[PDB]
Amino acid sequence: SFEKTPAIKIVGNKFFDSESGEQFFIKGIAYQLQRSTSYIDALADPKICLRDIPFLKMLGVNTLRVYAIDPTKSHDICMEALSAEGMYVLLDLSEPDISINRENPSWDVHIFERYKSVIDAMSSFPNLLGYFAGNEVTNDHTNTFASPFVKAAIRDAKEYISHSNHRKIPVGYSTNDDAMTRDNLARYFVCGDVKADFYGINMYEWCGYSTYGTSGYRERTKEFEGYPIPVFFSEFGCNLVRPRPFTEVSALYGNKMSSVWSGGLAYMYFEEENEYGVVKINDNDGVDILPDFKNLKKEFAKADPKGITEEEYLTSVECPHIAVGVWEANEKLPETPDRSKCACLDEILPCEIVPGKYEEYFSYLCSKVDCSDILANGKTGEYGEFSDCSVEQKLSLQLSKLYCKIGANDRHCPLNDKNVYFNLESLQPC
Numbered sequence: 419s420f421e422k423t424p425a426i427k428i429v430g431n432k433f434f435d436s437e438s439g440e441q442f443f444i445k446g447i448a449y450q451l452q453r454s455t456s457y458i459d460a461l462a463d464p465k466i467c468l469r470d471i472p473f474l475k476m477l478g479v480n481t482l483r484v485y486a487i488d489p490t491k492s493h494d495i496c497m498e499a500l501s502a503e504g505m506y507v508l509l510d511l512s513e514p515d516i517s518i519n520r521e522n523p524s525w526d527v528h529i530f531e532r533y534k535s536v537i538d539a540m541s542s543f544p545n546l547l548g549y550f551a552g553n554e555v556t557n558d559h560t561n562t563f564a565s566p567f568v569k570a571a572i573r574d575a576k577e578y579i580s581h582s583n584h585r586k587i588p589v590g591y592s593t594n595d596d597a598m599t600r601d602n603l604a605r606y607f608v609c610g611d612v613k614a615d616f617y618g619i620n621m622y623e624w625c626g627y628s629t630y631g632t633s634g635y636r637e638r639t640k641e642f643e644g645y646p647i648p649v650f651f652s653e654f655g656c657n658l659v660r661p662r663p664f665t666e667v668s669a670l671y672g673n674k675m676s677s678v679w680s681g682g683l684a685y686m687y688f689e690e691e692n693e694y695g696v697v698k699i700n701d702n703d704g705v706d707i708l709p710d711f712k713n714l715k716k717e718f719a720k721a722d723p724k725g726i727t728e729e730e731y732l733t734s735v736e737c738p739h740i741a742v743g744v745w746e747a748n749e750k751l752p753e754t755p756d757r758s759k760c761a762c763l764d765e766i767l768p769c770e771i772v773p774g775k776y777e778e779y780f781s782y783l784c785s786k787v788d789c790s791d792i793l794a795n796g797k798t799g800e801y802g803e804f805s806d807c808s809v810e811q812k813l814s815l816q817l818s819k820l821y822c823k824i825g826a827n828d829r830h831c832p833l834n835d836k837n838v839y840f841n842l843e844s845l846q847p848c
């Protein structure tokens with residue numbers, strides 16, 4: 419049974435419970451373990467999730483943000499246990515080792531396959547609230563050209579979900595709070611022909627015993643009035659002053675903010691020595707409640723957002739202009755990564771490379787052949803024909819071009835490295 423968690427849907431700039439029609443406000447907490455797979459999936463481990471859910475119930479949350487799941491594992495036990503306490507999940511599609519790289523952005527078959535795997539693993543659950551297609555990818559004025567890759571990812575995740583048999587779980591974005599870029603980012607993700615379904619801000623402006631006016635919350639709220647998609651704090655909980663009073667929660671669910679924002683999620687459940695936890699897991703794997711816990715609990719308990727209903731509510735935007743060093747996200751987006759096309763390279767290329775060396779060998783190979791066909795430029799909106807293939811496929815293409823330009827036809831690939839091999843399938847006459 420998922421009785422206690424009806425699916426949430428979006429109408430205009432609000433979330434609604436699909437059965438009752440009541441507006442849905444997120445009262446959440448970030449729930450993610452990390453090592454000190456590379457990531458840890460607490461929702462794949464019943465002994466972990468079933469330990470913590472009673473503590474999450476005490477806090478009074480209705481939503482978790484989860485940053486990374488292992489899509490090869492079952493999540494039925496934990497998702498049903500969450501559902502039984504009225505709890506929903508916001509889930510990032512990426513993981514630290516398979517994310518859009520803000521320093522060298524790409525939207526390719528490897529990242530898209532990750533996104534699809536997560537979608538296929540998690541979309542059966544009615545309490546899956548939504549997916550994030552990225553988290554703080556662009557984070558300042560030096561990497562705004564990453565954002566077209568994120569928008570392509572939003573488009574392609576939505577299309578994959580649309581073409582699947584799954585419920586149409588919304589796909590949004592989570593952004594940081596950099597003064598120079600925030601307004602342009604907010605506009606960019608709702609501009610043109612591809613839009614985020616919702617928009618989370620990682621919002622740390624309220625520290626200690628601040629106020630609506632002095633924190634910045636009043637000006638954030640004014641700039642987001644009339645924003646066309648649901649907006650919430652995908653993270654909050656500045657820890658400058660401890661124990662965190664979480665008095666921002668009273669402002670967030672109050673009358674000035676509840677008509678604009680769809681709530682938010684505290685960062686975070688586990689204490690992991692960034693001093694952001696509300697509990698701490700001891701050496702015996704037991705839960706020790708920290709002094710922040712009771713303040714978050716008290717504030718969420720008091721919070722009573724006056725929303726609207728779906729029926730009464732029911733009665734393109736220009737992309738920011740390009741300016742060098744300020745905003746360099748082209749409106750033109752990279753193409754949908756094509757697994758078949760890129761898989762053809764594995765079949766037909768004479769010289770292949772199995773997955774420091776990428777830098778050296780792209781630099782070597784791209785001095786000898788023209789690598790434009792694998793370059794992707796989010797500033798200029800120029801995306802090479804094979805720029806959507808995996809890093810190894812791209813490198814293999816360039817190696818093979820060099821092999822064909824030499825024209826020896828002797829099965830000797832022109833790069834001495836153990837990962838290089840002649841592909842015998844290339845001989846069988848994409």
Ligand SMILES: OC[C@H]1O[C@@H](O[C@@H]2[C@@H](O)[C@H](O[C@@H]3[C@@H](O)[C@H](n4cc(CCC[n+]5cccc6ccccc65)nn4)O[C@H](CO)[C@H]3O)O[C@H](CO)[C@H]2O)[C@H](O)[C@@H](O)[C@@H]1O
Nearest residue numbers: 450485486510512513514515517518519520553554555622
């Ligand atoms: O796509 C952009 C980048 O993505 C990186 O991986 C991401 C990871 O870095 C990211 O990690 C997640 C991390 O972002 C998040 N987190 C939240 C915080 C508190 C930040 C506080 N803070 C931030 C900024 C300004 C502040 C100002 C004042 C006060 C506080 C401020 N620190 N970390 O905590 C999660 C919990 O564990 C991580 O899982 O998770 C995403 C979801 O899986 C991954 O995509 C990739 O590794 C990187 O290559 C890529 O460039």
